[PDB]
Amino acid sequence: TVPNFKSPDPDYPWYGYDSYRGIFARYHNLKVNLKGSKEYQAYCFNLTKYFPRPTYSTTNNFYKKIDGSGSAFKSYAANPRVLDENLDKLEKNILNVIYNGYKSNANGFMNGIEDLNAILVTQNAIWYYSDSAPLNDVNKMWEREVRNGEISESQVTLMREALKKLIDPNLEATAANKIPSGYRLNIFKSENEDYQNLLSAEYVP
Ligand SMILES: [Zn+2]
Ligand SMILES: [Zn+2]
Ligand SMILES: [Zn+2]
Numbered sequence: 001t002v003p004n005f006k007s008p009d010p011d012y013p014w015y016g017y018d019s020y021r022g023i024f025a026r027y028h029n030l031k032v033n034l035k036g037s038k039e040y041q042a043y044c045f046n047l048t049k050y051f052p053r054p055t056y057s058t059t060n061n062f063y064k065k066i067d068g069s070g071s072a073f074k075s076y077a078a079n080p081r082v083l084d085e086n087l088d089k090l091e092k093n094i095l096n097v098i099y100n101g102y103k104s105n106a107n108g109f110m111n112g113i114e115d116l117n118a119i120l121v122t123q124n125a126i127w128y129y130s131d132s133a134p135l136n137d138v139n140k141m142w143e144r145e146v147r148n149g150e151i152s153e154s155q156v157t158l159m160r161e162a163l164k165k166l167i168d169p170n171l172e173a174t175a176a177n178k179i180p181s182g183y184r185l186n187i188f189k190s191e192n193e194d195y196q197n198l199l200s201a202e203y204v205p
Contacts, residue, residue: 003055004036007062012191014063016042016198017055020116024150027116028123030198031055032063032188041103041201042188043123046078047131049196061195063188065204068094076187076197077130090129096172097125098201099179100165106177109162114155121159125166126199138163 005015013034020029028051033039044051052061066072070087073094074080082090099106101122102115110118124141127133138160145151151159165171172178188198 002033002036002039005060005062006035007191009062009191012062012064012189014065014188016052016061016063016188016190017057018052019055021054022116024116026145027120029116029119032065032198032200032204040204041119042198043098043119043126043201044196045076045126045130045187045199046196047127047133048078049190050194051196052198062191063198064191066187066189068185068187068199072187073130076189079130079132081129081132092172093169094126094129094199095179095183095185096175097122097129097166098185098199099183100171100175101125101162101201103201106179107165107175109165111158113158113162117151117155117159118162121162121166122201124163128167130199135163135167 003015007013014032016032018028019031020027030042030052031039032042053059070091073090074087080090100109102110102118128135141160142151142156146153146156184203186200186204190197
């Protein structure tokens with residue numbers, strides 16, 4: 001089942017929402033849809049802004065859909081990781097992260113990682129680029145969860161290795177399966193600028 005919400009502003013007609021219903025605050029599972037249409041997977045593009053509310057909340061988040069590009073990725077990010085002012089490289093970097101992360105998993109980096117953990121890994125790789133999140137201690141990430149029996153040692157080992165592959169600057173060059181001709185993602189610009197702009201996990205027509 002998908003929600004069907006109509007925006008008060010037709011310029012921002014997409015509903016964005018957190019579909020995670022569980023008890024662990026570490027997890028989110030963001031989606032967008034359009035007046036009851038099939039839904040699409042999304043990610044937070046702004047680490048320092050609020051995540052979309054849970055589906056069916058009394059407060060609803062609406063969005064305008066924009067084609068992804070290096071320009072858009074720069075403009076809608078708070079602190080993007082750009083080398084030598086090269087927005088084409090920023091575009092390539094983000095596209096290759098998404099293509100290799102949840103759900104496309106084009107080179108198997110995600111294999112065996114439970115969906116919510118795979119989203120969490122991919123989300124961290126996106127923030128490495130959108131917010132210049134440092135990620136200098138990947139071998140210790142989620143150790144608190146391991147110690148407390150919340151994520152298995154086995155899942156966390158997979159997650160750490162996947163994250164390292166996703167943030168390698170040579171990902172595009174070394175991955176065997178390359179992004180397809182015409183590959184495109186979308187930015188969702190929040191109608192309420194206290195909430196995150198979103199990045200799709202596939203093309204959203
Ligand atoms: Zn939350
Ligand atoms: Zn490398
Ligand atoms: Zn604005």
